[PDB]
Amino acid sequence: GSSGSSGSGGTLRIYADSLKPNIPYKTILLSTTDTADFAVAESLEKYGLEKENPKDYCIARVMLPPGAQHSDERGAKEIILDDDECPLQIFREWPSDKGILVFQLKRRPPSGPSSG
């Protein structure tokens, strides 16, 4: 047992445009404390991945460049997160000037580029 669900907490739009193309975007109730792993799993289950390994997938945040003003995600570069980060808190205190922030769900680099 566990008591929770109070107030609002926060929301996070997990587009994850890759792991699940069929589905457009996903939104799960996130908090200003939860970790990535948690979200990952959640996001997974949401899409219907209640089996896959959430430890394999992480929450890669995509930040828009400073010199962008024409299209969307204009040559945006995402940077995987540690693991015990906050995809909600981060955004909550994310500078718009730095560019839009997006949290996609996709595999992370284990050790070096290109897993293969």
UniProtKB/Swiss-Prot annotation:
Annotated localization: Cell junction, Adherens junction
UniProt domain Ras-associating: residue ranges: 8-110
Consequence of gene disruption: Mice show developmental defects at stages during and after gastrulation, including disorganization of the ectoderm, impaired migration of the mesoderm and loss of somites and other structures derived from both the ectoderm and mesoderm. Cell-cell adherens juntions and tight junctions are improperly organized in the ectoderm-derived cells. No redundancy exists in the function of afadin during gastrulation.
Modified-residue entries (Phosphoserine), positions: 8, 18
Lineage top rank: taxon: Eukaryota
Tissue spec: Isoform 1 is expressed only in a restricted set of epithelial structures during early embryogenesis.
Role description: Belongs to an adhesion system, probably together with the E-cadherin-catenin system, which plays a role in the organization of homotypic, interneuronal and heterotypic cell-cell adherens junctions (AJs). Nectin- and actin-filament-binding protein that connects nectin to the actin cytoskeleton. May play a key role in the organization of epithelial structures of the embryonic ectoderm. Essential for the organization of adherens junctions.
Assembly with partners or alone: Homodimer. Interacts with F-actin, nectin and NECTIN3. Essential for the association of nectin and E-cadherin. Isoform 2/s-afadin does not interact with F-actin. Interacts with ZO-1 and occludin, but probably in an indirect manner. Interacts with RIT1, RIT2, NRXN1 and BCR. Interacts with ADAM10; the interaction locks ADAM10 at adherens junctions following ADAM10 recruitment to adherens junctions by TSPAN33.
Protein name: Afadin
Organism: Mus musculus (Mouse)
